[model samples]
Target chain A: LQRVTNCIVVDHDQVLLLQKPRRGWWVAPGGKMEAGESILETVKREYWEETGITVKNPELKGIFSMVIFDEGKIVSEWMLFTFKATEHEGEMLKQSPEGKLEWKKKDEVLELPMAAGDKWIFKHVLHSDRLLYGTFHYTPDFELLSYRLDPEP
Target chain B: LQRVTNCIVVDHDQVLLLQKPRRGWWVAPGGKMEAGESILETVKREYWEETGITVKNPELKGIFSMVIFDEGKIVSEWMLFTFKATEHEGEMLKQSPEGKLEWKKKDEVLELPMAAGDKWIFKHVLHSDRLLYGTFHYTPDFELLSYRLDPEP
Candidate 1:
């Protein structure tokens, strides 16, 4: 099980996301949590590393379990902690080691290609104050098998 | 990476738990989720397999990330989905394949030996209706290093 932290940096109706080359999917700008770091610290550091922007008081908004299954057996799994930030400082980097960084409108962010579970997460972060919880099951090919969301999505 | 599910079956004033012989620590009855099964189905099936009780409409209460590190490197990690069931049917088993099954009182449950993170989980599940979210970091030896809980625990 891998541990990862990611965040949606929201500002003036726009959200910052990274577009991965492999899947062409847009994801929040964040990554693996380093040892001995709090989730908040992880999100802050990862966001800065990927986008060159220092997130201020990033707030956790969702927790999710991601699983990859193959032929009726689990092949890989990881836990994702999602955060949202409205305040930040510093300039965006010209290039990120992870992917291309882009700021997208709230409405347009959801329309981008992404993991199916991410659509629900972005929706909740943009619209709900209550924390969201879910588990996303997918096949080895990255096809979604099933999912469960608290408060019924 | 693996996905596991567990449930704390609540009765009038008690919660059913299992005591593992190896660690002599108590935990809610649950195990690794089967492939192609939803988290809800996994919890119900694992609970019934261990306790001989069928849980009715088990409600999801918590989502957590469990990580084990060795000298600042992650050695293992997993996702845990926790559920609580106030209603159950069938008789408690005299012998559980997993370990000693016991119905511990609400107050006593917290005092029993358990994983440090589980203490927080039980505390939230027994007292709050809002879902709990957290990530627990520990050493490979199982010594907890630090943790973060939503709602500030």
Candidate 2:
């Protein structure tokens, strides 16, 4: 099992994200949560470490359970806490050690390549005020098999 | 890495529950989700198997990530999907292979001995219509460390 946290920093009409080189997948600029850290602190620290910006008033937006299966058996699983922020402070990094950092228009963020579950998350966090909760079942290679979403999609 | 589903079956003014002898704790009737089973199937099957009842139109109420930490490191984790139903068909069993089954008053359910996180779950699922999402952090010995609940409980 693993634990992780990520945040979507919405500044004006844009959102900060990281583009992984391996799959060219775009994701929020955040990472693993350290022991004993609150969700708010994890999002702020991860965003700052990855993009040199401190998220202000980061709000919890989504909570997800991600499961990976291999040949009909459970292989790996992780819990992800997602946050969304509308304010921040600091300089933007031109490049990040994890990947290339970019600020894309809010509308285009969902169109970019990302895990299928992530697309749903981006949709919910960017547009809905209600908190989102889901469990995404995926194959070992990350192919989404099935999912359950609160509030019935 | 496991998936579990449970449901609180409400009838009139009371709620169905299971009492575990080991801890003298009351819980909603549920068990592990079998391979290739949907959340609905899991809850219905487990409820019927335990109580000889079939829950009808069970609605998703909460999604949670349960993590167990050993010495500050995550050792095990699982996803728990909670549902609530107001109607059911069949008779209650005198006893269950898993534990003693009973129907307790809705208000009295929360007063029973249960995990700290579970008390919150009962509070939200029983009184509020809004869906809840949270992560429960706990020590290997079952001591609660911290937790984050959406919509701020």
Off by over 4 Å in 2: A21-23, A33-48, A52-94, A115-117, A120-125, A129-153, B1-5, B9-11, B33-49, B52-94, B115-117, B120-125, B128-153
Per-candidate DockQ values are: 0.13, 0.11
Check candidate 1 and list the clashing pairs: A1-B1
**If you assessed candidate 1 against the hidden native complex, which CAPRI class would it receive?**
incorrect
What would the per-residue lDDT of candidate 2 be over residues B72-134, giving only the tens digit for each residue? Answer: 588887778898999889999989987898889988888899888899989988898776777
User: Looking at candidate 2, what is the lDDT of residue B15?
Assistant: 92
Give the local distance difference test score of model 1. Answer: 0.82
Residue-level error in angstroms, candidate 1, position A141: 7.2
Task: Indicate the DockQ of the complex predicted as candidate 1.
Answer: 0.13
Give stretches of model 1 more than 4 Å off: A1-3, A21-23, A33-41, A54-81, A84-94, A113-117, A120-125, A128-153, B1-3, B21-23, B35-41, B54-81, B84-91, B115-117, B128-153
Q: Report the alpha-carbon TM-score of model 2 versus the true structure.
A: 0.65
- Per-residue CA lDDT of candidate 1, range B113-148, in tens? 988889999999988877666789988767789888
Q: Local error of candidate 1 at A149, Å? A: 6.1
